[PDB]
Design a protein around this ligand. Structure first.
Ligand code: CLF
Ligand code: CLF
Lengths: 456, 520, 456
């Protein structure tokens, strides 16, 4: 594994921790977060979520200015909570996300919560159900991935409450698209398994209705989060985006936790379903065999004809990127470069990465990568047929004429990618066919044996 | 009178940030406040001072490494969100730089990391010899001395030049703090440090233009055709070294006075360079602006020739859309100068009725301009929040809204179409051709057959379900007369999808020709 | 409307009538057709269906040779029926499809059916349920569209039998993909409407199973076809692919017939649902309003930003092509060329086409077109941004650098296009987004304002 030798960043792959906490927060029903810090820290993240989803989500700011930084800005947070609660009477959850600036100056937002709950909520909102929490997100640590992981842990720790036992499991999806959640919920529904899904982000896709306006929102409720303590078990798909919350549930309420695999491709979907079957006692039914068979038939049409020996560079959220690498290897492609864009120390200990090093021979893994890793390797002579990654690496694809399949977050340069799964059997079929069609369009653009697309 | 919103009664400070134009009132009667601090928790639209400095004014420069001293997040958040293009193969859009400050650098100092990051960036891009370092929140609090590091890096390389922009996000109420900071910094550090190679007979500085979708290239084309040398452009499609030569222009042609009036006023005060405010948008404002510039140099006849030619080519097409757009209501919701650049021209030349304007960051000067150029009853808001915008829409019922992407996606979910006031849709919107492109965008948004389909409830018992098709022209022709509908002079927009390719391929030809003659 | 002035064909758009009858036949359960004629007439059609579906379907031949042409070849058909029935014991429906050669020499296959049912079936297959029919398909008449239309009429006329009345309607889909049928069946199921769907072609997409092999087949049964006579009404989506069968049902059994519209795009899907609601008495429910709203939200993201004023050439099956033209006009695009690839005389009297002529100003409609119509118009200066058509026009797209969205039949140069709808609200969202993504990839390949794909 190669750690990036440069210390500065040229073209970052991820953004900072507060952005991840904000993205986790928008997945909860009746939740508006307050980002404690500068206005850019919230406005850019709302724009970035808007680029991915083409929808607007409500996140607030405490609006720290020069006097706030010099003199302390806890009064800004107190004002922000009051203004937000008076003007939005439907809000029940207010997470207070710190940024780099207020993490440096040491604003004690935890202690402020106690004062607010003892003074402001009982006085000016008597009888109203308001839950306040803090998510500490110093942007000079980690990345948006670690920010998301920490926020999920913080939401679960705030709400999970022991009660009567439930037959449900906890499914912590990780940072996934609305299309991914639909696929996972479909799998669980065929298997006849009830779950507390963290998070229900299908309602991110909101309809354009004739009369009743209907805005984009999350659908995970406080009741879902409260009931996490009473589940039969927790399956966290992403080790870097939800293992902290699952570890908390195991340690505090003795809820057994199964971490991974990310169900990318046929084989990892099987492993995910087997974990669900072990946790719940529910057999894998014949309908899933058929849906798996359909995905495999599509893959067989293109596999050793078009995907075998294709050279691929992959970057995404870490779990998705690693799972995509494994799926590409199963499809007989040749992954050449895997970019893991932050400083997490668990990558080199990850059993999935250790297996990749053992049996993926011509694959280079760069940890703490940026896009200059990919681009400067191409300039030095790395030859690729395909890239899997999100939209901020689009100019590498455009300028060096390597086609790219848009996966992960954010994918803003293609229409409706958030509505398609990359997880499950449906996602595997979608992924493999999108790779083939991306390659087909490239052969036609370059006139590269383009006559061969007739009797395959 | 001061307009108070139902949603803002609990924050009474908001009352004096909105006015409604009333007959018998002038600028000295009432005026919304501006350039104040933001009320926390309002979900306002405001950004940070780093945005105003780096994202808005700094990055447009095309031959510069723009490196932010801070963590990766600030650099990522402003990357690939803007549409200022350049003839340097869009270097300023494709490459972005951070020092990637970590916690060890916060605790122990990040100046060694900054120096090493600067050397790495210069090494990776050996054809780039210019650099700007921007402060973020993190490195501005801890007291990193960027200026000393820039001095050290310059002397170690011997062939690079570094500009320092100390504009952290918290240092100001909005992007406006950034505008002011970067203007004064560039003036004090960089202006006067390079001499022009050639000075023509009519030299201008084009100030306050950021080349959104080629807006500057459109204006350079006009100036070339009047035989006017644009010494430098601040800063769209601008080169570092030309901007160091600003002290040698005969005239400052100021487009956006919200972001660049500081450097214009100081160049006027120091070097005696006159300041000429112009409009780039509209037919009549643009014609008058070209006339003034040509008149200053005594070459008026050249401007008149451009104007006649452009009117003959584009006025029939603009009037096709103007006939179909009369009486339609629009909310004008940019951040800054585009509210007063557009409010009067859009009503006069497209027939739209401007029912509201707002600014995110503009001072009281922008509001006095905007209130003056708007009609009576228009709603003028300063530092709007999301709930105020919803209330305004429910009160004013606009047919289209000009706003940002994310605000546009919000108002879409309330029935209204939007055009991106910031990045345009099918821009550039400057020029005579650009105004026609703007009119077509407005007409396409308003008269979309999909918009009427979305308004239809198919589960209603007697629902007006139809088959076949409708076109926007079918929808818009329902509003015009027979004389307009069968006019033989009005026709739709006849222009390419990329109007800048031909304009740019003309500015470059001109440059080549001028070089040839000069070198001879 | 322009009729092609040349008399010969350069690059045909459709194939001949027998191919259409063969495609209609593979949609029936337990049906293997015998193509009466030369072996090429069946082998090429099996290959063509294979190109579209990447699956193998059983169609037989009577294998007419020189002596079969000079002498009679009815003995070949008698032998073919016996061989096919002995070796395939599960076959219940055997349609005899004639070709050009046996239509020219006047082989009396109708009279042969009478002899076969009187002698061969009672004797050598006693008690076996075997239904034989003839489909007369002279390839010098019409095209594969007319062949399909005639075969659907022939299947319905063979089987439809008056019995106890049924609450079902008849849905004759026309020549559509398995993805199209799934979408239509979804719409009916939300509306709570039972239908005899002609044909059930979702099982064309067969799974790759672990143990038990399962081949591609049709799922319309003899019982479905028998019950067509007892329906509340018939909705034939395609006027050129199913109006004859619907007219027969009205004339013979007084089953009211509603012809069209082809539910391509938002507006025509509404009209189709209103026809279903009128026929059955079933209201349009709120779930369909929501799914329609979702499709409209996707369209609104791309419509007046990217689709408005795009110049489009369209060819497909006639009904789909006309419906695609109408959808493109609703999307504010500029259709420039519509190619209707056969000699049907109903196009110029088609009310949809008359409306296009009235209100689509810069659109040229070519009837009896071939691909040289499109290509020679581009060579003469027609400028297009997009093409909608099937795969046999791919070299126009490749060579003149006009992107193409693969619609209709056959689409063999892209992976899995048969699994996506072009009908209904789901199809409208899929169509509009695929057109946007095709345009996006083209802007990136040509570096045509490709920087604009960031904050749309
Ligand atoms: S890493 Fe914020 S955008 Fe920045 S200069 Fe401060 S206001 Fe402006 Fe991450 S938490 Fe945020 S986005 Fe950066 S500041 Fe830090
Ligand atoms: S065995 Fe061979 S392919 Fe067959 S016809 Fe004869 S030469 Fe030709 Fe032709 S037009 Fe269609 S495909 Fe046939 S029914 Fe006639």
């Amino acid at each position: 594994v190669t750690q990036k030798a440069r210390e500065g960043t040229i073209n970052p792959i991820f953004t900072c921790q507060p952005a991840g906490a904000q993205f986790a927060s928008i997945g909860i029903k009746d939740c508006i977060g307050i980002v404690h810090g500068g206005q850019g820290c919230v406005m850019f993240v709302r724009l970035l979520i808007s680029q991915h989803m083409k929808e607007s989500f409500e996140i607030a700011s405490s609006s720290v200015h020069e006097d706030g930084a010099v003199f302390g800005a806890l009064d800004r947070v107190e004002t922000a909570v009051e203004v937000l609660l008076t003007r939005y009477p439907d809000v029940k959850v207010v997470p207070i996300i710190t940024t780099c600036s207020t993490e440096i100056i040491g604003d004690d937002v935890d202690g402020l919560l106690s004062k607010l709950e003892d003074e402001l909520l009982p006085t000016k909102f008597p009888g109203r159900e308001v839950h306040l929490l803090t998510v500490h997100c110093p942007s000079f640590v980690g990345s948006m991935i670690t920010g998301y992981d920490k926020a999920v842990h913080d939401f679960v720790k705030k709400f999970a409450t022991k009660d009567e036992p439930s037959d449900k499991i906890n499914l912590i999806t990780g940072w996934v698209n609305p299309g991914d959640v639909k696929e996972l919920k479909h799998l669980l529904e065929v298997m006849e398994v009830k779950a507390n899904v963290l998070f229900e982000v299908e309602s991110f896709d909101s309809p354009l209705m004739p009369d009743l306006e209907h805005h984009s929102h999350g659908s995970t409720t406080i009741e879902d989060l409260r009931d996490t303590a009473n589940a039969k078990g927790t399956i966290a798909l992403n080790r870097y985006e939800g293992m902290k919350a699952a570890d908390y549930l195991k340690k505090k309420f003795k809820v057994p936790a199964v971490i991974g695999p990310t169900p990318v491709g046929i084989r990892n979907t099987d492993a995910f379903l087997k974990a669900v079957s072990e946790m719940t006692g529910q057999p894998i039914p014949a309908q899933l065999v058929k849906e798996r068979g359909l995905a495999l038939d599509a893959i067989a049409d293109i596999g050793h004809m078009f995907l075998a020996d294709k050279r691929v560079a992959i970057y995404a959220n870490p779990d998705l990127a690693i799972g995509l690498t494994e799926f590409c290897l199963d499809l007989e492609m040749k992954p050449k470069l895997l970019l893991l864009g932050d400083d997490n120390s668990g990558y080199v200990k990850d059993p999935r990465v250790l297996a990749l090093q053992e049996n993926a021979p011509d694959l280079e893994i760069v940890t703490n990568a940026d896009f200059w890793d990919l681009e400067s390797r191409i300039q030095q002579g790395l030859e690729l047929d395909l890239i899997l990654g999100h939209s901020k690496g689009r100019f590498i694809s455009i300028d060096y004429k390597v086609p790219m399949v848009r996966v992960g977050f954010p994918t803003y340069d293609r229409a409706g990618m958030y509505r398609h799964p990359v997880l499950g059997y449906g996602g595997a079929m979608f992924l493999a066919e999108t790779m083939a069609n991306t390659l087909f369009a490239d052969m036609e653009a370059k006139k590269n044996k383009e006559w061969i697309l007739n009797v395959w | 009178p001061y307009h108070e919103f139902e949603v803002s009664k609990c924050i009474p400070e908001r009352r004096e940030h909105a006015v409604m134009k009333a007959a018998g009132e002038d600028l000295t009667s009432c005026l919304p406040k501006g350039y104040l601090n933001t009320i926390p928790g309002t979900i306002s639209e405001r950004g940070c001072a780093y945005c105003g400095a780096k994202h808005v004014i700094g990055t447009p420069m095309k031959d510069v490494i723009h490196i932010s001293h801070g963590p990766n997040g600030c650099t990522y958040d402003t990357w690939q969100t803007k549409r200022y293009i350049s003839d340097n193969d869009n270097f300023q859009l494709k490459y972005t730089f951070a020092t990637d400050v970590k916690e060890k650098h916060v605790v122990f100092g990040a100046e060694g990391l900054l120096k090493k990051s600067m050397h790495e960036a210069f090494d990776a891009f050996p054809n780039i010899k210019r650099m700007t370092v921007y402060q973020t929140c993190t490195t501005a609090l801890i007291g990193d001395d960027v200026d000393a590091i820039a001095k050290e890096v310059m002397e170690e390389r011997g062939d690079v030049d570094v500009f320092v922009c100390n504009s952290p996000g918290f240092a100001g109420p909005s992007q406006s703090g950034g505008h002011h900071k970067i203007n004064i910094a560039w003036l004090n550090q960089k202006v006067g440090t390079v001499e022009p190679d050639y000075l023509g007979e009519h030299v201008i500085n084009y100030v306050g233009e950021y080349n959104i979708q080629g807006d500057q290239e459109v204006m350079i084309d006009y100036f070339n055709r009047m035989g006017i040398q644009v010494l430098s452009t601040f800063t769209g499609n601008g080169s570092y070294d030309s901007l160091r030569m600003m002290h040698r222009a005969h005239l400052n042609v100021l487009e956006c006075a919200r972001s660049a009036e500081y450097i214009c006023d100081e160049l006027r005060a120091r070097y005696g360079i006159p300041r000429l405010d112009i409009d780039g948008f509209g037919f009549e404002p643009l014609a008058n602006s070209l006339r003034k510039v040509a008149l200053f140099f005594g070459i008026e006849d050249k401007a008149e020739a451009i104007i006649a030619e452009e009117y003959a080519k584009w006025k029939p097409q603009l009037d096709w859309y103007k006939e179909r757009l009369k009486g339609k209501k629009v909310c004008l919701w940019p951040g800054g100068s585009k509210l007063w650049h557009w409010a009067h021209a859009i009503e006069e030349e497209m027939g739209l009725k401007v029912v509201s304007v707002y600014t995110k960051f503009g001072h009281q000067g922008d509001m006095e301009k905007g209130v003056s150029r708007c009609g009576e009853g228009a709603l003028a808001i300063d530092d709007p929040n999301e709930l105020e915008s919803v209330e305004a829409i429910e009160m004013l019922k606009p047919d289209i809204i000009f706003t940002g992407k994310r605000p546009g996606e919000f108002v879409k979910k309330h029935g209204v179409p939007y055009l991106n006031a910031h990045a345009y849709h099918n821009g550039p919107y400057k020029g005579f051709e650009g105004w026609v492109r703007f009119a077509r965008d407005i007409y396409n948004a308003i008269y979309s057959p999909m918009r009427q389909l979305a308004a239809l409830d198919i589960s209603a018992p007697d629902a007006a379900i139809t088959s076949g098709f409708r076109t926007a022209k079918m929808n818009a022709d329902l509003t015009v007369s027979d004389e307009v509908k069968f006019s033989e002079v009005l026709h739709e927009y006849t222009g390419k999808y990329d109007s800048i390719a031909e304009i740019r391929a003309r500015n470059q030809a001109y440059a080549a020709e001028q070089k040839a003659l000069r070198d001879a």
